[PDB]
Design a protein around this nucleic acid. Structure first.
Ligand SMILES: [Mg+2]
Ligand SMILES: [Mg+2]
Ligand SMILES: [Mg+2]
Ligand SMILES: [Mg+2]
Ligand SMILES: [Mg+2]
Ligand SMILES: [Mg+2]
Ligand SMILES: [Mg+2]
Ligand SMILES: [Mg+2]
Ligand SMILES: [Mg+2]
Ligand SMILES: [Mg+2]
Ligand SMILES: [Mg+2]
Ligand SMILES: [Mg+2]
Ligand SMILES: [Mg+2]
Ligand SMILES: [Mg+2]
Ligand SMILES: [Mg+2]
Ligand SMILES: [Mg+2]
Ligand SMILES: [Mg+2]
Ligand SMILES: [Mg+2]
Ligand SMILES: [Mg+2]
Ligand SMILES: [Mg+2]
Ligand SMILES: [Mg+2]
Ligand SMILES: [Mg+2]
Ligand SMILES: [Mg+2]
Ligand SMILES: [Mg+2]
Ligand SMILES: [Mg+2]
Ligand SMILES: [Mg+2]
Ligand SMILES: [Mg+2]
Ligand SMILES: [Mg+2]
Ligand SMILES: [Mg+2]
Ligand SMILES: [Mg+2]
Ligand SMILES: [Mg+2]
Ligand SMILES: [Mg+2]
Ligand SMILES: [Mg+2]
Ligand SMILES: [Mg+2]
Ligand SMILES: [Mg+2]
Ligand SMILES: [Mg+2]
Ligand SMILES: [Mg+2]
Ligand SMILES: [Mg+2]
Lengths: 46, 93, 77, 102, 62
RNA sequence: CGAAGGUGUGCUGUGAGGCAUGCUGGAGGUAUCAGAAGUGCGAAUGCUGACAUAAGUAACGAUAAAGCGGGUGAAAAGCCCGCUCGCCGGAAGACCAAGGGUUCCUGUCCAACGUUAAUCGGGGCAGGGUGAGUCGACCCCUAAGGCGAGGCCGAAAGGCG
RNA sequence: UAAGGUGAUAUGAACCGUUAUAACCGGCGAUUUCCGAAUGGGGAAACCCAGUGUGUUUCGACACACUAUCAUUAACUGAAUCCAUAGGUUAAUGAGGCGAACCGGGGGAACUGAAACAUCUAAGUACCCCGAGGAAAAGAAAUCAACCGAGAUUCCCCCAGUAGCGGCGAGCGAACGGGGAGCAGCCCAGAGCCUGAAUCAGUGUGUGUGUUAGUGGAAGCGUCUGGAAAGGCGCGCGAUACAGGGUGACAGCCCCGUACACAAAAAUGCACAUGCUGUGAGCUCGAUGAGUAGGGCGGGACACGUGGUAUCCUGUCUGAAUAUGGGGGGACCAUCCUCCAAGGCUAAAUACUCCUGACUGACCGAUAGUGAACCAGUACCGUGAGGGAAAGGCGAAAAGAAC
């Protein structure tokens, strides 16, 4: 049947994108933790 | 549209292929690799000064580089810009 | 915010204690009022967010003295 | 600061060719040398059609640890050891056994 | 080089820079059409250009 | 002139064990007396890996359906060519968007992938291929809603505008 | 510094270099796209679109520079409203973001313990937030003592699981005094006189000395086994060097080192010296921190849970004296002793480790030790926060097996 993941790049980027992380104090902490963990991909990008 | 330092950097290489050979025989059009950030105007000027022939029109596309896997890892070739540069009827080279 | 521009009085925290001595966290707010002071030396009214305590400071020192403290503090009015 | 150098005549101290002498043909960053006529191997070289090259058993000098050779002091007939000193304003090599510059 | 260069004017070094960028264009086309036997030339030209631009810069800077 | 470990054997200890030695192995081992413990495993529906069992069993994914001649090939029910047969046909055709991202075309190869074989493939490798003033985006314009100089508000963080 | 080189898988190609512009090492420079605080505006990061000024042997658009916000300052402007003030533009200077732990502060849990549970505990812990420094904070008595005296702060050892607090339960838990580390004392609340007089900081120069490259660095040969000798055996030698590593088996004497002795054109640390802009020295006569201390109410902090409860902070209401004065000495009073609040600064002993160098381990040795010995915060999973592996060993040498 119909499953839970229905893609939309526009909505992907608006919810989870780099600029959205940067817009709030807590999203900027998501990036900090990820960079400290040494993640290759901070967010899903182009 | 030009400054010579930039014009000299804009054309990278002839591109060879059946499509490109035919485009020359059939349409007096030469196919090139040009700088990624090159514009049709630059390409036109560049071709006209360096290869010293008159240009009719330039068409351009951007080629996506193919990806190749390698066990668990991928490699990616570079995108580049292709230019279809049509010479005027009095054909040269 | 709930802050006296004269004394710095601001919310502080503490407990409600019941008869059975249950502590629940609470605040104590300052007794603030926006009030218009006539400043003679500037032919003008100045509105300060002041605790009542702060008002008594202004009765004692004079508004000129207290506004001078505001400047030196960098605080604008 | 290198004690053994290209074109030196050296004598082998260690290995199957102990005792033989030969000219250093090149020294490798790995601390190994190729000495003429020393430490030969008979490799089975695969054919390569690019050039229509057939295969063959080839004899080549294989690389030998440089610490397995000594500088040869032709003037005394023996293995020797290098040291450094300054003559004129330039650094030189000299044989330990007889204090002579190389 | 780098001294032969340092003893030219700004006028001359711009001329030489053009000359090198032209040579560089021609080598590129040769290599790209599998006609360059001497692959090593590219790096010498590339680096000459650097040297020349590095000197223009040091002459302007003071 | 063969260490540790592995595998046999002989002797010995009440036992946990010990010593000797054949074979394997190929560079380490360690008496004695002391010293310190990540010190002993069959169980915890323990943890990780490896390998059994059921068993060459069930199954091979819509009951739209196949038959033959020729070809390629080491091999052809399945790939190519041909003649027939059957199925869909408000779709099982064609074209957009979203989403994917080279899967497209050609050559070449078949281990693994493909629920079988595979010469074939959306599989491997290489090369090629996407051409715009007027098709779309960008662009100009706004909707819900978002952000928001100053500003209002809030222990701080911030909320609202 | 050099006779070898153009980083790795990783060959090959074309080349560079050998006595000094090959390469390599270190100091100082140059260049340093785009995104990112991101700062010309916008935005779904690495993209879209501008304004103004400059440039066109072609003066097209393309190129180059500037243009974010906030704060302090200045100049020019400028309302309601006469002056003024707000406002407005421009310029100068600064900030912004990131990041280990330690550090000061604003907020502040619960499971749990009490063999249930609410006072109490956990605990001012976890967490969130703000800010700073190489340390932070604290600090030169309105402090203790006890009629003898001590003499700021911080840290360590005792005092002591004591005195106490406590549904006097569970628990919580001092200080006096003693031994130590370290030690350092100043300024304003003001005018005169003498006047740049001690001090600090920014900073030029000097010497000294560290750091960032480096330089020299002793002494073994025969024989046996073996594929190979560092092993056995023989006889030598160095040692302020027998720390360690490598080399075809275990090497003081083969190689790199090690003991010891040395070295910097350049940048930088720290130190004495010195120039500089600024800061003010000592002297006399002054002055002496008020919405404060105290108090009523509610809370909080003190080991101290309101108790007979001193001391501290203060949300709220009040409110002194002025050295002939005031605080404290654990309710309170007298006596006596002691100190001087309502202004500020201050090094050391103390806390820590993202990082750099050197050295060490009765620490691990591939299911261990990091999650990761290996291209791992990867592959993979998840919309996302987030979660998160497996996986080392031919040989001495590829001699990696021609035919
Ligand atoms: Mg196009
Ligand atoms: Mg063992
Ligand atoms: Mg044993
Ligand atoms: Mg024992
Ligand atoms: Mg058991
Ligand atoms: Mg059965
Ligand atoms: Mg059956
Ligand atoms: Mg069946
Ligand atoms: Mg089927
Ligand atoms: Mg088969
Ligand atoms: Mg593919
Ligand atoms: Mg295809
Ligand atoms: Mg198959
Ligand atoms: Mg394919
Ligand atoms: Mg056209
Ligand atoms: Mg808003
Ligand atoms: Mg704002
Ligand atoms: Mg921008
Ligand atoms: Mg716009
Ligand atoms: Mg922006
Ligand atoms: Mg007016
Ligand atoms: Mg900051
Ligand atoms: Mg309980
Ligand atoms: Mg700092
Ligand atoms: Mg301090
Ligand atoms: Mg006394
Ligand atoms: Mg304690
Ligand atoms: Mg003491
Ligand atoms: Mg002392
Ligand atoms: Mg030596
Ligand atoms: Mg061996
Ligand atoms: Mg006083
Ligand atoms: Mg008091
Ligand atoms: Mg009582
Ligand atoms: Mg004071
Ligand atoms: Mg370290
Ligand atoms: Mg592991
Ligand atoms: Mg193992």
């Amino acid at each position: 049947m119909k499953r839970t993941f229905q893609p939309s790049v526009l909505k992907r980027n608006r919810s989870h994108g780099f600029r959205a992380r940067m817009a709030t104090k807590n999203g900027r902490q998501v990036l900090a933790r990820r960079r400290a963990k040494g993640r290759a991909r901070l967010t899903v990008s182009k | 549209m030009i400054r010579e330092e930039r014009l000299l950097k804009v054309l990278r290489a002839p591109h060879v292929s059946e499509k490109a050979s035919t485009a020359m025989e059939k349409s007096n059009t030469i196919v090139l690799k040009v700088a990624k950030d090159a514009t049709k105007a630059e390409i036109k000027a560049a071709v006209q000064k360096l290869f010293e022939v008159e240009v009719e029109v330039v068409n351009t596309l951007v080629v996506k580089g193919k990806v190749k896997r390698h066990g668990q890892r991928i490699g990616r070739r570079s995108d580049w810009k292709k230019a279809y540069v049509t010479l005027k009827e009095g054909q040269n080279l | 915010s709930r802050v006296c521009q004269v004394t710095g009085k601001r919310p502080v925290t503490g407990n409600n204690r019941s008869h059975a001595l249950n502590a629940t966290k609470r605040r104590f707010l300052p007794n603030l009022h926006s009030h218009r002071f006539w400043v003679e030396s500037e032919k003008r009214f100045v509105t300060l967010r002041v605790s009542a305590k702060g008002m008594r400071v202004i009765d004692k020192k004079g508004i000129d003295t207290v506004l001078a403290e505001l400047r030196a503090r960098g605080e604008k009015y | 600061a290198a004690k053994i150098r290209r074109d030196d005549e050296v004598i082998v101290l260690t290995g199957k060719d102990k005792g033989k002498r030969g000219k250093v043909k090149n020294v490798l960053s790995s601390g190994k040398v190729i000495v003429e006529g020393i430490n030969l191997v008979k490799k089975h070289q695969k054919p390569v059609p690019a050039l229509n090259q057939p295969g063959g058993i080839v004899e080549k000098e294989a690389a030998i640890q440089v610490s397995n050779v000594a500088i040869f002091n032709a003037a005394t007939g023996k293995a020797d050891r290098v040291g450094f000193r300054f003559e004129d304003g330039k650094k030189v090599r000299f044989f330990k056994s007889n204090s002579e510059t190389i | 080089k780098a001294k032969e260069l340092r003893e030219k004017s700004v006028e001359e070094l711009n001329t030489e820079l053009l000359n090198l960028l032209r040579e560089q264009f021609n080598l590129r086309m040769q290599a790209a059409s599998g006609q360059l036997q001497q692959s090593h030339l590219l790096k010498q030209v590339r680096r000459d250009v650097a040297r020349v631009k590095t000197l223009l810069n040091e002459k302007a800077g003071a």
